[PDB]
């Protein structure tokens with residue numbers, strides 16, 4: 001009697017979108033235990049290994065326990081997806097916590113990096129490689145200041161092929177080890193990624209950077225970086241030494257995770273008491289806030305355009321479904337039929353229970369209610385506006401957050417940075433601007449930026 005995910009869990013709400021698919025907050029129908037479930041769509045994500053190999057990894061992952069590694073509880077598979085059920089953590093991404101601080105020192109960075117290396121060391125002893133380690137994969141257990149770090153997605157890269165969509169690979173290029181690019185890699189790739197993360201914590205700038213994905217990769221593959229930024233003068237020699245050892249090009253010469261834990265710098269700056277010399281890295285924290293805001297705005301822009309393309313698709317599809325269901329030809333439908341077509345559209349709505357409630361939120365939202373005969377046309381408008389909300393609202397939020405001086409505007413230099421990170425061709429976005437505002441003087445407000453994005457997705 002093979003078990004069934006939706007027999008055991010109900011979806012509560014969406015937690016986010018991660019590598020390989022959506023993460024949904026779920027609840028055990030008997031025990032009330034809340035859990036974070038990564039749902040991998042077999043249609044969007046191709047497998048690299050065979051079933052046998054994936055089930056063996058899962059079985060191993062369930063038996064490992066470390067304070068800095070996300071705990072996996074359960075694994076299910078049906079016809080259309082894979083479901084990975086883990087512990088839910090509520091502290092958010094590390095860097096989003098870091099940028100809320102007004103003080104940040106080498107002690108804070110060593111506390112951070114020690115946890116990461118401790119989790120990586122443990123996983124490498126069990127022959128699991130992350131490969132895709134980056135800031136987004138570092139979650140905080142809770143919103144508390146003293147919260148432990150939990151690494152997510154350890155081992156998935158081995159069995160599933162990563163999205164080639166830019167909206168999914170923003171800020172992947174900065175962290176990947178050069179041997180991963182060339183195809184022969186081992187567990188040392190996780191030390192390199194960690195090394196990049198440490199460089200960023202102490203300087204707030206990526207060691208390997210450029211205007212677009214491909215320029216960043218060209219820098220990584222060459223392997224050259226420097227410590228000539230002014231804010232490195234404030235950093236201990238010990239920290240730089242550890243960095244050089246983590247960023248060693250040839251993997252066989254690069255320090256192991258385990259050895260990195262024992263390095264003088266980690267031993268010195270994680271002793272809770274001794275502040276022998278501990279200034280605050282003010283420039284770094286502000287660089288990280290700029291870095292983070294840029295990454296988040298580019299991401300939000302791509303998802304805005306993606307949501308706008310989805311809403312074109314689904315509006316037309318839903319209308320054609322309702323049209324054919326309308327046997328009267330009067331343009332009206334009852335509740336069950338609305339539910340039926342919306343389910344037919346299907347392919348957060350993990351069971352029939354999820355669908356009926358979304359429909360009910362819209363029928364309530366249909367302003368005032370006459371029961372029996374519903375104008376299919378207007379239900380479509382409202383169902384779809386609902387779907388785009390999260391993404392337009394999020395777009396404005398990200399715009400406001402990027403605009404740190406509250407100027408209401410972003411410069412064309414800033415647009416170049418954002419569009420380079422979003423991988424929108426240079427000639428393409430300026431042609432678009434020229435058409436939105438024929439009189440602009442090198443800056444756009446929120447509405448203009450939004451109008452630009454619409455034009456860049458064929459509207």
Ligand SMILES: CCOc1ccc2cc(-c3nn(CC4CCNCC4)c4ncnc(N)c34)ccc2c1
Nearest residue numbers: 015016018023036038084085086087088089152153
């Ligand atoms: C081999 C383990 O297989 C699993 C199984 C379930 C997983 C669930 C989560 C998860 N994702 N998110 C949403 C975050 C929003 C911010 N961007 C990053 C994602 C989460 N938010 C809260 N808790 C979570 N657990 C997640 C991530 C990785 C998992 C890996």
